[PDB]
């Protein structure tokens, strides 16, 4: 039978959270002038022989009240914490996202993957070693992705599913 995994994608505005989610779900690359409106998306996919239903919240509108977001924070099982490899501030923001997740879940062992997106770009300002060190300090995996080329996209979300399975019976 199907197993449901509730996933939440968080990170600074403009890092490519909608692009990653839409790449995964709809298999095309978005490049929109307009800022993302928060929404959730479902994907059915076989991961390691298990038929999975991924219920994914692409967070956005980060200053505003969202009933749906509150519910995903309550029930969400794993988090993608996304920065952009050409934006040092988005990387510096990761700690605040991680600390918020830890506070709201009241736990240090929440399934999480650190994602460095936009890895297709020639304008890197965050070294892979800095990101690996941060992820090691949190005890979580680090993966680079490009929503533009699809590099690493499936890997990031499937790794998160595998992290959830490592933490709890599914």
């Amino acid at each position: 039978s199907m197993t449901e995994y509730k996933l939440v994608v968080v990170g600074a505005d403009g890092v490519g959270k909608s692009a990653l989610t839409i790449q995964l779900i709809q298999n095309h690359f978005v490049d929109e002038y307009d800022p993302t409106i928060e929404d959730s998306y479902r994907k059915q996919v076989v991961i390691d022989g298990e038929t999975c239903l991924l219920d994914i919240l692409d967070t956005a509108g980060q200053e505003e009240y969202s009933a749906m977001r509150d519910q995903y924070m309550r029930t969400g099982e794993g988090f993608l914490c996304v920065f952009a490899i050409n934006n040092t501030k988005s990387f510096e923001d990761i700690h605040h996202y991680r600390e918020q997740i830890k506070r709201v879940k009241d736990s240090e062992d929440v399934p999480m993957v650190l994602v460095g997106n936009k890895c297709d770009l020639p304008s890197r300002t965050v070294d892979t070693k800095q990101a690996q060190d941060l992820a090691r300090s949190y005890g979580i995996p680090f993966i680079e992705t490009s929503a533009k080329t699809r590099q690493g996209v499936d890997d990031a979300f499937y790794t998160l599913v595998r992290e959830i399975r490592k933490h709890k019976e599914k």
């Binding site: 980060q62 509150d70 924070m73 309550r74 605040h96 918020q100 709201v104």
Partner: peptide, 19 residues
């Protein structure tokens, strides 16, 4: 806005305060 509430969550006590 508090740097420690990067994503507004209504039941996070940090988010409900304003500086």
């Amino acid at each position: 806005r508090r740097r420690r509430c990067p994503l507004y969550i209504s039941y996070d006590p940090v988010c409900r305060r304003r500086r």
